[PDB]
Design a binder for this molecule. Structure first.
Ligand SMILES: CN(C)CCc1nnc2cc(-c3ccccc3)c3cc(Cl)ccc3n12
Ligand SMILES: CN(C)CCc1nnc2cc(-c3ccccc3)c3cc(Cl)ccc3n12
Lengths: 369, 368
């Protein structure tokens, strides 16, 4: 009756050097550049990355004077692409700019639906699957940049499958079932050396030992040689599940990067996460989903909906009343509460927008009820 | 009403900049498959003010006129004059496509995909997303037959349904709120549009039993909507619209512009196939199926099933049934669902799921 009560679930993450994530980071690098000069800048910056080319497309209303060449190349440099042998060089890439730039009860800028989610299974109130997947990429980047593993290159993908049990609506991670790691590398290091390092210096430095056992399946560099990576074009907003909960909770479809606070796709999703995390940390539930919806002409949310998966003694109707007395989810109010005019967005564009307590929406609000 | 909840899904029309890109990408995919069934295609489209950009990689024996494909797609969508904000005759098309010239084959990538099905509609789909899609389809229908000649291709719809649930089964009670925004010419007045949207669109799509006098209508809520179409549109930026409207789950992979060798598409189609087969087979009322792959590996890394409590059989038992009836290796999925056919442009608007003309929407008869 053991394997009848357990289930597997998988989440993935990608490194800074993955073509899609390159675009997210560049898009938010542009957003930050504008906000540093003009806190009220309106930005919708889409980035396309392909073989020796970065294209910026979208609309900007800003007083800022932004050197897009410098912004893009410094972003690519920071990511780690500085030579043709790595498949991409910030010094020589073609940068094409196609941005049309112009100089509290406000209606939503669009329509749409957004979700926030939280779970007590980790201290950061995030699913273990997506937390581990992210941290594997962060470790890779760390070991690349300090020279511990100098053969590493920026592009990578990780995938973590966790064995779960459910406990009265709450989910409880038992063990890591399967781990996948594929990462770009130079032409010198051999497969064996890489696979040993990925297990001992990456996986074992990231995953708590209690989740690993002798049955855990490792797929390390499963395709083999991975010398040329980075920019099949990458596009901004093509990793939105990686950006959020790794498949847990729910998603309304809106991408985050390249968008300023007036885009409810971003601000309302941050706020919804804020609500969800505040509820769980507040001890009101162990696990919770929050949906918000807007109309392009209306300031107040069209609907606010709450699912606590049965992990609360309070009803969802009751939780909604608590949320309404503690939160104002109008776009113009979210900005003030979460201080969203700060140039803080490039840091969100890799390793997930949620689960890191340096972000305002990751600091639980003390609830009054 | 402690047991009721609201849930909202949205859809967009063919003229929405993101969906324009999805359609173009799949028009390109189809063009190759029509000449070369074994074509490898990864086509990304970018659409902005007077410009369509194609970027990606193609391995094909086909000789494809990308100019004709793109412009004919834009024409079909309905953008044929500058007064509409976009004209297939004059748009700038930039092509940056690099073109190059069994059952146990490894996955082309890694990733996770979900399939979902629910017995709340005949098409085994959530009511919210079915209605949202069908509202946009009705708009295009009435635009193209000339019933509402003031209509233009760009549109967005949003449907909020009031639900009840019984141990995981979801029971739609009524439509709570409907939002419709649609592009239009400079002549027709707002009142004429709003009354038409209610009487000729909404009442023609939504079952009367779901509508009452408390239903909230937001028709042309932003007002004047003359300029629509190409904020740039991008391929793969409407993946929740493409699937279940927020229900079930999503692994993050976009569909359009990708050939069948991309598990992001083929395995998501297969998972829907599995899920719909289970519900239509009477094994559950509602079900979520996750599958995951690793690059280079043929068999799924994991297959996982959540029936939300809507089956008397356990999920382990449902898994036993799935494994005995389905082979979820990438190379076998292609053969079972006939995925080398140029059928993909048809998927790129109004949702990939819930329409029975697609192979993954024909339930497999289960043996167990
Ligand atoms: C008794 N039985 C073993 C319990 C199994 C169980 N209990 N709670 C959940 C939640 C999800 C889930 C749903 C949506 C999104 C993410 C995860 C889930 C998903 C999958 Cl594929 C399989 C099982 C799942 N599950
Ligand atoms: C007794 N109480 C009224 C029950 C409420 C309820 N019962 N089943 C579901 C499922 C979802 C759901 C989850 C994930 C995706 C889609 C829908 C959901 C979502 C929201 Cl925002 C609110 C409530 C939801 N729900």
């Amino acid at each position: 009756f053991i394997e009848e009560g357990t289930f597997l679930f998988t989440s993935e993450s990608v490194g800074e050097g993955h073509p899609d994530k390159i675009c997210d980071q560049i898009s938010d690098a542009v957003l930050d550049a504008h906000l540093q000069q003009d806190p009220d800048a309106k930005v919708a910056c889409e980035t396309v990355a392909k073989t020796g080319m970065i294209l910026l497309a979208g609309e900007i209303t800003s007083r800022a004077a932004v050197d897009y060449q410098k912004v893009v190349r410094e972003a690519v440099k920071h990511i780690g692409y500085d030579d043709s042998s790595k498949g991409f060089d910030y010094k020589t890439c073609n940068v094409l700019v196609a941005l049309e730039q112009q100089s509290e009860d406000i209606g939503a800028g669009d329509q749409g639906l957004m979700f926030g989610y939280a779970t007590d299974e980790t201290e950061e109130c995030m699913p273990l699957t997506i937390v581990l997947a992210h941290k594997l990429n962060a470790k890779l980047a760390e070991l690349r940049r300090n020279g511990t593993l100098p053969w590493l290159r920026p592009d990578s993908k990780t995938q973590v499958t966790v064995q779960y049990m459910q406990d009265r609506g709450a989910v409880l991670p038992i063990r890591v079932h399967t781990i996948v790691i594929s990462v770009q590398h130079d032409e010198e290091v051999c497969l064996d050396e890489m696979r040993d390092a990925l297990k001992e210096k990456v996986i074992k430095a990231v995953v708590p030992a209690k989740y690993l056992d002798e049955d855990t399946i490792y797929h390390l560099q499963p395709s083999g040689r991975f010398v040329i990576g980075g920019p099949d074009a990458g596009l901004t907003g093509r990793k939105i599940i990686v950006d959020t909960y790794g498949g847990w909770g729910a998603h309304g479809g809106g991408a985050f990067s390249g968008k300023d606070y007036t885009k409810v796709d971003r601000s309302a999703a941050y706020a919804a996460r804020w609500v969800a995390k505040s509820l769980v940390k507040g001890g009101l539930c162990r696990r919770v989903l929050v949906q918000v919806s807007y109309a392009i002409g209306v300031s107040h949310p069209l609907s606010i909906s709450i699912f606590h998966y049965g992990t609360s003694q309070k009803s969802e109707r009751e939780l909604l009343e608590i949320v309404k007395k503690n939160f104002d989810l109008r776009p113009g109010v979210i900005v003030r509460d979460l201080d969203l005019k700060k140039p803080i967005y490039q840091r969100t564009a890799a390793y997930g927008h949620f689960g890191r307590d340096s972000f305002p929406w990751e600091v639980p609000k003390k609830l009054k009820y």
